[PDB]
């Protein structure tokens, strides 16, 4: 119960970290089961836009998704939309970026209408190590939105 709480997203958000292999280490349970486990994602710089090109294992099954991502607003502001398209059926929407060291790892959020909330976390390397994983805690420990003991971290075996 209860709205979507309000977000604060970060002020110093680098676009042109926007590109290459980014994995998705660790996610709400809700999050990897509507879309995958083993998820990585290669983001490839077009124009304004940014491609995305996405693979997971969906209820069993592999599957590349594909989608487009612009900045909404002031790109600093982490606030981005993506399309994502999966099986011939296209969705869109807005999330928003919780965190970034704009180098290692980005925290995305959303959240919808009671209300539903999912959380991603997605590092340049498979394991969040060192520098990243320091970070990262910080930021849980003092989060407002995340359910640290909610997260689920990906095995890559
Ligand atoms: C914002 C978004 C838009 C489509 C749908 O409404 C679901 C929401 C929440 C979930 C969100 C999609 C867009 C998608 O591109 C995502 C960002 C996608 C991911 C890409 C990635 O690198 O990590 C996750 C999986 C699902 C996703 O995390």
Same mark, same amino acid.
């Given at each position: 119960? %209860? *709205?979507?709480?309000?977000?604060?997203?970060?002020?110093?958000?680098?676009?042109?970290?926007?590109? /290459?292999?980014?994995?998705? @280490?660790? *996610? $709400?349970?809700?999050?990897?089961?509507?879309? #995958?486990?083993?998820?990585?994602? +290669?983001?490839?710089? =077009? %124009?304004?836009?940014?491609? @995305?090109?996405?693979?997971?294992?969906?209820? /069993?099954?592999?599957?590349?998704? +594909? %989608?487009?991502?612009?900045?909404? &607003?002031?790109?600093?502001? %982490?606030?981005? $939309?993506?399309?994502?398209?999966? /099986? #011939? !059926?296209?969705? =869109? &929407?807005?999330?928003?970026?919780?965190?970034?060291?704009?180098?290692?790892?980005?925290? #995305?959020?959303?959240?919808?209408? #009671?209300?539903?909330?999912? !959380?991603? !976390?997605?590092?340049?390397?498979?394991?969040?190590? &060192? =520098?990243?994983?320091?970070?990262? +805690?910080?930021?849980?420990?003092?989060?407002?939105?995340?359910?640290?003991?909610?997260? @689920?971290?990906?095995?890559?075996?």
């Amino acid at each position: 119960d %209860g *709205a979507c709480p309000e977000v604060k997203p970060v002020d110093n958000f680098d676009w042109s970290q926007y590109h /290459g292999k980014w994995w998705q @280490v660790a *996610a $709400y349970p809700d999050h990897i089961t509507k879309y #995958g486990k083993c998820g990585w994602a +290669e983001y490839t710089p =077009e %124009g304004k836009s940014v491609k @995305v090109s996405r693979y997971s294992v969906i209820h /069993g099954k592999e599957y590349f998704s +594909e %989608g487009t991502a612009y900045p909404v &607003g002031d790109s600093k502001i %982490g606030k981005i $939309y993506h399309s994502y398209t999966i /099986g #011939g !059926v296209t969705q =869109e &929407g807005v999330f928003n970026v919780l965190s970034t060291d704009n180098k290692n790892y980005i925290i #995305g959020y959303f959240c919808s209408y #009671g209300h539903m909330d999912l !959380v991603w !976390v997605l590092s340049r390397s498979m394991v969040l190590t &060192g =520098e990243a994983k320091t970070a990262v +805690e910080n930021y849980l420990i003092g989060s407002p939105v995340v359910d640290s003991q909610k997260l @689920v971290y990906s095995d890559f075996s």
